[PDB]
Design a binder for this molecule. Structure first.
Ligand SMILES: [Cl-]
Ligand SMILES: [Cl-]
Ligand SMILES: [Cl-]
Lengths: 99, 99
């Protein structure tokens, strides 16, 4: 699809089988969601996204469906004021900014 | 142009007569640069560049040249860890996200 930027680009996606809102954030290197359960194993990680260092849980191999497309991705769970889809997933999606 | 997201989408732009690096950030409502002296007058504004709430200088009608395109825009000057082109500018350029 083609997402306009008149509004915040917040879409409903299905992440690890659950429906969530998230913003497509080209300023974000990684994908980070607020506390929720994801399937499988995780490892703790320190990241700098995006207001101080934070400890997050990193889950690899997470199925995400976004606007009809399915990817398998690394997702961080921790303190974030918004759920954020970042460039790691956007690259997997083939997403570009076009003008 | 078509900007891919394998790396941070940082571009060199011309803003108020100066060349600056900035990141194309679909997660940012507004366009904010670090301390710079822009042309014209400004008014104080609070914004949630978190950061917590930060006081910024708001400049209106600032010319911006980005990849050969010229726009006249509102720019915030204040604390920000990077110079950010946000959606206000992107919409003026006709930017979309596409996958
Ligand atoms: Cl949600
Ligand atoms: Cl710069
Ligand atoms: Cl204000």
């Amino acid at each position: 699809p083609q997402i306009t930027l008149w509004q915040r680009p917040i879409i409903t996606i299905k992440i690890g089988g659950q429906l969530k809102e998230a913003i497509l954030n080209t300023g974000a290197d990684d994908t980070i969601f607020e506390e929720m359960n994801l399937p499988g194993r995780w490892k703790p990680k320190i990241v700098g996204g995006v207001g101080g260092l934070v400890k997050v849980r990193e889950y690899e191999q997470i199925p995400i469906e976004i606007c009809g497309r399915k990817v398998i991705s690394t997702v961080l769970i921790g303190p974030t004021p918004f759920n954020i889809i970042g460039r790691n997933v956007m690259t997997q999606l083939g997403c570009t900014l076009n003008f």
